[PDB]
């Protein structure tokens, strides 16, 4: 788990160093943006069921074959649509964990590592999840620097699927 605090510890531990004024501004700058990032995590938490089901329908409008084609990898059934809504809820949960810790720690560990082994095995396309995340990027309805923190960790997830 990389945080700003568990990264400046690690460069202090590389040099045998007591925590100098170099490593006391890397952890101070997390505190001047933990205000704006924890309101964005609180806002995305409350509007989760609007954003999950709205993005699951915006996938199905762009890619209509996924609701039509038979076989278990598609959203053409009841349980096929339930597992797609589970997956965007897994994706949106790791965005809010990154706004708590201030970096891409929890989606590196719990989401990204080992993801391409799944998407090739179970025949799931990585462009089904760009369209789900590009909905959430410009339909969360945030503004200012609260939107700047949520839009940083959303397109980190787009770049590890692209």
């Amino acid at each position: 788990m990389k945080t700003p605090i568990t990264e400046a510890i690690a460069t202090a531990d590389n040099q045998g160093r007591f925590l100098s004024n170099t490593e006391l501004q890397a952890v101070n700058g997390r505190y001047q943006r933990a205000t704006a990032s924890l309101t964005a995590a609180k806002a995305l938490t409350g509007s989760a069921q609007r954003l999950i089901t709205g993005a699951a329908q915006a996938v199905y409008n762009k890619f209509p074959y996924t609701t039509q084609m038979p076989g278990p990898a598609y959203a053409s059934s009841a349980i096929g649509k339930a597992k797609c809504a589970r997956d965007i809820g897994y994706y949106l949960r790791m965005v809010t964990y990154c706004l708590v810790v201030g970096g891409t720690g929890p989606m590196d560990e719990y989401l990204v590592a080992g993801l391409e082994e799944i998407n090739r095995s179970f025949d799931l396309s990585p462009s089904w999840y760009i369209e789900a995340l590009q909905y959430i990027k410009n339909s969360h309805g945030l503004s200012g620097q609260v939107a700047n923190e949520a839009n940083a960790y959303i397109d980190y997830a787009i770049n590890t699927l692209s």
């Binding site: 719990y110 080992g114 082994e117 095995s121």
Partner: protein, 172 residues
């Protein structure tokens, strides 16, 4: 590693004699079935990603408590490491199909596999029920009459079954 020819070398060295003439006519029976061995390993490894993903899919259907959050196979790191070990047994069983004995399967893959799983905490009764899906998806794959002419291949499926039940009793 040892195959069937390497058995009776080391089964007569240790005592240090030869092998004798009454054993090798059983071993020249084995080369009559040498062409019915290599089709059958070609039947398994051509479908080597359709026996894995069709049986992990039928594993999480009956056991939803592994893909639920807080489960063993929950995250994408531990889903990829569940499909890794489901294919690892498919290699070392088919290695024991081509060789004639078990002694590369239970020396490189089953020697401490359940005690790997007791230390990690994976359900060792539940890896046996994924393997027994892969037993039934491969024995019933290796009885097709397309691609080969018809003949009886029964003993190899018992030999092919007999290493799939050897991984079914290794992991519990």
């Amino acid at each position: 590693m040892l195959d069937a020819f390497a058995k009776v070398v080391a089964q007569a060295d240790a005592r240090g004699e030869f092998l004798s003439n009454t054993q090798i006519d059983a071993l020249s029976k084995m080369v009559k079935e040498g062409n019915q061995r290599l089709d059958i390993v070609n039947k398994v490894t051509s479908n080597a990603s359709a026996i894995v993903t069709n049986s992990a899919r039928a594993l999480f259907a009956e056991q939803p408590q592994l893909i639920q959050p807080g489960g063993n196979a929950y995250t994408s790191r531990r889903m990829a490491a569940c499909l890794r070990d489901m294919e690892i047994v498919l290699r070392y069983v088919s290695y024991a199909m081509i060789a004639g004995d078990s002694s590369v399967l239970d020396d490189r893959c089953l020697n401490g596999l359940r005690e790997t799983y007791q230390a990690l905490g994976t359900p060792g009764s539940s890896v046996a029920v994924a393997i027994q899906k892969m037993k039934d998806a491969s024995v019933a794959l290796a009885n097709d009459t397309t691609g080969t002419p018809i003949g009886d291949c029964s003993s190899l499926v018992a030999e092919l079954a007999g290493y799939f039940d050897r991984a079914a009793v290794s992991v519990v």
